[PDB]
Write a protein that binds this ligand. Structure first.
Ligand SMILES: *[C@@H]1O[C@H](CO)[C@@H](O[C@@H]2O[C@H](CO)[C@@H](O[C@@H]3O[C@H](CO[C@H]4O[C@H](CO)[C@@H](O)[C@H](O[C@H]5O[C@H](CO)[C@@H](O)[C@H](O)[C@@H]5O[C@H]5O[C@H](CO)[C@@H](O)[C@H](O)[C@@H]5O)[C@@H]4O)[C@@H](O)[C@H](O[C@H]4O[C@H](CO)[C@@H](O)[C@H](O)[C@@H]4O[C@H]4O[C@H](CO)[C@@H](O)[C@H](O)[C@@H]4O)[C@@H]3O)[C@H](O)[C@H]2NC(C)=O)[C@H](O)[C@H]1NC(C)=O
Ligand SMILES: COCCNC(=O)c1cccc(-c2cc(Cl)c(C)cc2OCc2n[nH]c(=O)n2C)c1
Ligand SMILES: [Ca+2]
Ligand SMILES: [Cl-]
Ligand code: NA
Ligand code: NA
Ligand SMILES: [Zn+2]
Length: 805
């Protein structure tokens, strides 16, 4: 109950929220149904509209007007934004030449340039070019400030998950807003866009920018605008707050527009009806910049123009229906649309079975427009699993499609022509970023980057210390003129052993055989040098990875490859090798088909054994350095050492063997040599983070050989591909992947065919950032390059997307 009897006089859009049931005059009062009786009258004035005209210039103040054109308005901070233009012969901000802002030019008593986040919903990246004719204010921001060709949202590419990722630096799985609809089994509560429950603080994890600011003594304006407050009034409110006294004035502000998303759902992303909403958003930006110019803050404020997600063409006829796959359709609850989430309708039903639901949804129709996944099998780049609000069964829906439970759901709920929510690598889902102001660079293009990175930068912009988040702080230093964060490399926690020859062959009883007893002082010295690391500068180009946790491991050198071998996991944490453009692929000789060789540097007690693989009928083995790429028949024996062996399901070995036999050589030819680092990943609790040994759920039968959940590779070469990978003077180029280690190829519908038709497609789906692999392994790569650390940080966050341009 709200006692709405008090008044909002002198309190309109008050910053602090008063204790109920006293009536509120803050922006959120509309949302809680708790405003004072006179809120609309006093705080939402509209009389005479939003612009000055010639006849209002120097008028007598009239407190009823929406904004003012009287002489006292500047000092009151409540002129219409076009006031100086209409009445003082000033130009609009957009008509001024742009001039570099080398230093903040701020009024006296400003302690730091304010930050204004101008956020727009549904603003697809290509609108910057395709709508450029009708968005001159936005185009001036873009071309004069710092911009990216696009910014990658998080998955799912919905509004609340993305704005709250912007606010926190966190993946949706960590901040908890994992969709637009949600059930939390612990609370036994549901979250919906419409309604009241969404305001409860228990949904909202991490620490958003406004709370980070407040805790550290920086005041914030409102971020969540009540939907009924018009845009012109949000702008005027920001401008008024900016005229407050130094002690009361916020340093950080947000504006939000529900356009062009709102129209894009109705008309599709490029419907002719979309021109007008783009014009209107540009008008609003003009109003802000004119308003800042009046207050003399246009060369003082940092402005971020940022979208939450794009928009794709999606109509009712492109809907897949679970009723066409499942007979039990009434025993499930589906969260539908541009992604699918499935759980049992009733928790009292023990006849509900996720295994057969997945199977009934797998490759059932030739052009099926969605793919079912257990959430832990989703591409790791999506970081979408470690939350009880994310259902075990997930459907990744093709772009341009919807999924629904039954047809009745679609017509008793064509309306829409646009939607979003798909995989965050999809081009149509990409959004925008522009930074403009004294702290941003002048006329600078930067590469595309992920919205999870912005929280750190907004904190830098405000001199705040960021709460722990998923950005990689320093990876966006190149956006900034100053206030950069100067990160240091993490310290290595475990130093390696360097074992020499310590064991005789007969000490090993591993049940392994090799046809290798085939027998020179010129080349005896040669092999000794190779085992001591004489070729190491060729295969380990960027230094050895640092191990950032406590463990026991050995560096092992070979002619063709170097490895960091874990005595705990009985396999390499990483294997590093370089394949030049000229390298030759050979095959595994017949006499060496089943060969596995004890490694005399490593004890039997810390080795895998062949018997275990023999006894395990499901599990086979593969090698991290491929025998196919050996530099000589004699170097090929190294590739069969028991220390290069890793456990692999036969179904996975189809993938692995094709990558090693065909793809590495193809990349080396295309990229002028590549350096490859490969290894196992263990993520049994799907938290995106390296498992400790007591978290491993599966071993090769009868042994303590742990089974990886994934295998990674990091493939690096010279960005200037006229230089070979092993002699590169400048910036690097990388692509990486994290392939799920699965006992079937059910994920790939065309897998009965030749690997050349399906494997590369699979690997592209499972593209990754080197940073994702760092989290999953506790390793730190690129420790020794000639490149600045901030540049390496940007490389480590790079994602190779495989979308066209
Ligand atoms: C992306 O960035 C983020 C942020 O850095 C990374 O997430 C962090 O990872 C840490 C490890 O997973 C985790 O640290 C744990 O915190 C526990 C206490 O946490 C509370 O306090 C923090 C800080 O204020 C708060 O942020 C947390 O908020 C979570 O929980 C609420 C719901 O309860 C949500 O509102 C919120 O969204 C958030 O949920 C998310 O995280 C939790 C995990 O905390 C998930 O379960 C959710 O799915 C969701 O994703 C918390 O309120 C602390 O208790 C833990 O300590 C245990 O483990 C350590 C190991 O060192 C051990 O020493 C202790 O003994 C202890 O073990 C005991 O508990 C065990 C489990 O119950 C039990 O088995 C043992 O036997 C022991 O009794 C731990 O330190 C940190 O909280 C999160 N932070 C956030 C914000 O998510 C994330 O990893 C990054 N992602 C990637 C890929 O890099
Ligand atoms: C009690 O509530 C829990 C608190 N949660 C929020 O405060 C919240 C929720 C969601 C989006 C944001 C949010 C975040 C950022 Cl970073 C930006 C720039 C804009 C944002 O919202 C803009 C907005 N105004 N009106 C509206 O409908 N939206 C989406 C903020
Ligand atoms: Ca883990
Ligand atoms: Cl959703
Ligand atoms: Na086997
Ligand atoms: Na298949
Ligand atoms: Zn939308």
């Amino acid at each position: 109950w709200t006692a709405t009897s008090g008044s909002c006089k002198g309190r309109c859009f008050e910053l602090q929220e008063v204790g109920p049931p006293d009536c509120r005059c803050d922006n959120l009062c509309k949302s809680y149904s708790s405003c004072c009786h006179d809120f609309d009258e006093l705080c939402l004035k509209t009389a005479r509209g939003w612009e000055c005209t010639k006849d209002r210039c120097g008028e007598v103040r009239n407190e009823e007007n929406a904004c003012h054109c009287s002489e006292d308005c500047l000092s009151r901070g409540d002129c219409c934004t076009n006031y100086q233009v209409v009445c003082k012969g000033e130009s609009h901000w957009v008509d001024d030449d742009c001039e570099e802002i080398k230093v903040p030019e701020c009024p006296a008593g400003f302690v730091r340039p304010p930050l204004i986040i101008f956020s727009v919903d549904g603003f697809r990246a290509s609108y910057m070019k395709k709508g450029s004719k009708v968005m001159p204010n936005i185009e001036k921001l873009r071309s004069c400030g710092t911009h990216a060709p696009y910014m990658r949202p998080v998955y799912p590419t919905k509004t609340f998950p993305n704005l709250y990722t912007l606010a926190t630096g966190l993946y949706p799985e960590s901040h908890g807003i994992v969709g637009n609809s949600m059930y939390d089994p612990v609370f036994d509560a549901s979250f919906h866009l419409r309604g009241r429950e969404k305001f409860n603080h228990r949904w909202w994890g991490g620490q958003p920018l406004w709370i980070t600011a407040t805790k550290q003594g920086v005041r914030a304006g409102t971020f969540f605008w009540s939907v009924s407050i018009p845009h012109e009034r949000r702008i005027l409110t920001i401008l008024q707050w900016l005229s407050l006294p130094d002690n009361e004035r916020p340093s950080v502000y947000a504006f939000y527009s529900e356009q062009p998303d709102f129209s894009g759902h109705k008309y599709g992303p490029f419907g002719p009806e979309m021109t007008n909403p783009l014009r209107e958003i540009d008008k609003t930006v003009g109003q802000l910049m004119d308003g800042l110019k009046q207050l003399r803050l246009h060369r003082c404020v940092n402005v971020i123009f940022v979208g939450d997600h794009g928009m794709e063409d999606v109509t009712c006829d492109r809907t897949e229906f679970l009723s066409n796959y499942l007979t039990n359709v009434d025993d499930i609850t589906l969260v539908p649309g541009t992604l699918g989430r499935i759980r049992a309708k009733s928790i009292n039903n023990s006849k509900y079975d996720p295994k057969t639901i997945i199977a009934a949804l797998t490759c059932k129709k030739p052009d099926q427009h969605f793919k079912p996944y257990m959430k832990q099998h989703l591409p790791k780049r999506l970081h979408y699993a470690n939350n009880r609000r994310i259902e075990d069964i997930h459907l990744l829906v093709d772009r341009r499609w919807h999924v629904a439970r039954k047809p009745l759901d679609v017509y008793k709920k064509c309306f829409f022509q646009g939607d979003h929510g798909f995989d965050n690598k999809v081009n149509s889902m990409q959004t925008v970023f522009v930074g403009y102001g004294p702290t941003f660079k002048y006329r600078t293009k930067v590469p595309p980057f992920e919205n999870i990175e912005l929280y750190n930068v907004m904190c830098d912009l405000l001199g705040l210390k960021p709460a722990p988040n998923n950005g990689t702080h320093g990876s966006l230093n190149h956006l900034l003129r100053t206030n950069t964060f100067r990160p240091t490399m993490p310290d290595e926690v475990s130093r390696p052993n360097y074992p020499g020859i310590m064991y005789l062959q007969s000490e090993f009883d591993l049940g392994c055989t090799c046809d290798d007893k085939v027998e020179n002082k010129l080349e005896e010295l040669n092999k000794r040098l190779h085992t001591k690391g004489s070729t190491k500068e060729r295969h380990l180009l960027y230094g050895r990875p640092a191990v950032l946790y406590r463990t026991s491991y050995d560096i092992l050198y070979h002619t063709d490859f170097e490895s960091g071998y874990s005595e705990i996991f009985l396999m390499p944490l990483w294997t590093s090798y370089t394949i030049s453009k000229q390298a030759e692929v050979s095959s595994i000789p017949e006499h060496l088909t089943n060969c596995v060789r004890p490694d005399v540097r490593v004890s039997p007690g810390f080795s895998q054994n062949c018997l275990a693989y023999k006894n395990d009928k499901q599990m086979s083995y593969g090698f991290l350095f491929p025998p196919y790429l050996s530099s000589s028949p004699e170097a090929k024996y190294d590739a069969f050492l028991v220390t290069n062996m890793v456990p692999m399901y036969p179904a996975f070995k189809r993938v692995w063997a094709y990558f090693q036999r065909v793809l590495v050589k193809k990349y080396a030819s295309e990229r002028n040599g590549v350096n490859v680092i490969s290894g196992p990943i263990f993520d049994y609790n799907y938290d995106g983070l390296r498992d400790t040994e007591d978290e491993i759920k599966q071993y090769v039968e009868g042994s303590s050989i742990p089974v990886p959940t994934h295998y990674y590779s990091i493939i690096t070469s010279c960005l200037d591909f006229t230089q070979p990978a092993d002699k590169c003077d400048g910036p690097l180029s990388v692509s990486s992947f994290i392939l799920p280690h699965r006992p079937d190829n059910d994920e790939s519908c065309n897998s009965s065919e030749d690997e050349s038709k399906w494997v590369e497609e699979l690997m592209k789906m499972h593209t990754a950032r080197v940073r994702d692999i760092e989290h999953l392994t506790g390793l730190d790569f690129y420790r020794k390059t000639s490149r600045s650390y901030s540049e390496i940080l940007t490389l480590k966050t790079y994602l190779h997307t495989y979308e066209s341009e």
